[PDB]
Design a binder for this molecule. Structure first.
Ligand SMILES: COc1ccc(Nc2cc3[nH]c(-c4cn[nH]c4)cc3cn2)cc1OC
Length: 257
């Protein structure tokens, strides 16, 4: 199978992702280089939806330059019927990698954490709060984590819908501190092998636990005290009492050794 994006021809290899009106394909260009093409169908898309897509593509294009922890967008073709986005191909998303890997190397975790902070820090510096960070939003590209989206474009039914990374303030109702909670949940999962409220099956009981101050989050003792402190700092229920990204970037866990 084959497709054209801005005059350039691409051979389709396999379908990566999907959605109600979107498909992601693994492709090859004329020079036999590997890419990901995100196809978006705009037939049933309303004006609100279109502007959400246009806004996200604009921010993805702009933030290319500011950090290599943001996915590469090489080119795109946008008409009234479709969007074709030629992007960087990743090895695997962080969620699939975490679900597959039994244990996680402490060096590998610290490395991924650094990348997650750099990517999220960059979007914040441009006025963007993601508000829905999960491990699925990150891509492993050459042992390096990259942020694939900014949470602007309207989400579609095909990890999606999950409340395990939701800050207490999002359940009550958004500031950059909201992303710190979600990042803290991802690190807690990479530390303890589960998210802080993963054991609570019932969604209502789970939402009640996240917002409950009397519901103490357990932080079992580990050889990395710096790591335990990060987790405790990210997971402060009060946004005003929570650590910021510039503060996490100066933290012993990210800087020592
Ligand atoms: C585990 O399956 C994979 C997951 C991700 C990628 N790589 C990938 C995924 C992507 N999703 C998007 C995307 C951006 N917004 N929505 C989807 C872009 C992109 C680039 N490479 C490759 C995989 O192996 C076949």
């Amino acid at each position: 199978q084959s497709m054209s994006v801005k005059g350039r021809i691409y051979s389709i290899l396999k379908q990566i992702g999907s959605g109600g009106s979107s498909k992601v394909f693994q492709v090859l260009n004329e020079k036999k280089q590997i890419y990901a093409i995100k196809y978006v169908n705009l037939e049933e898309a309303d004006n609100q939806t279109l502007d959400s897509y246009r806004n996200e593509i604009a921010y993805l294009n702009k933030l290319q330059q500011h950090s290599d922890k943001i996915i590469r967008l090489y080119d795109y073709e946008i008409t009234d019927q479709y969007i074709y986005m030629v992007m960087e191909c990743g090895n695997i998303d962080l969620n699939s990698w975490l679900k597959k890997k039994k244990s996680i190397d402490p060096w590998e975790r610290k490395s991924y954490w650094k990348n997650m902070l750099e990517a999220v820090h960059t979007i914040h510096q441009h006025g963007i709060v993601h508000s829905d960070l999960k491990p699925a939003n990150f891509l492993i590209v050459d042992g390096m984590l990259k942020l694939i989206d900014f949470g602007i474009a309207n989400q579609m039914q095909p990890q999606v819908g999950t409340v395990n990374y939701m800050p207490p303030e999002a359940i009550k109702d958004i500031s950059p501190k909201s992303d710190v909670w979600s990042l803290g949940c991802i690190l807690y999962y990479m530390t303890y092998g589960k998210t802080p409220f993963q054991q609570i099956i019932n969604q209502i009981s789970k939402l009640h636990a996240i917002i409950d101050p009397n519901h103490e989050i357990e932080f079992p003792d580990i050889p990395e005290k710096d790591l335990q402190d990060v987790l405790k700092c990210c997971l402060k229920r009060d946004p005003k009492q929570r650590i910021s990204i510039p503060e996490l970037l100066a933290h012993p866990y990210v800087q020592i050794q």
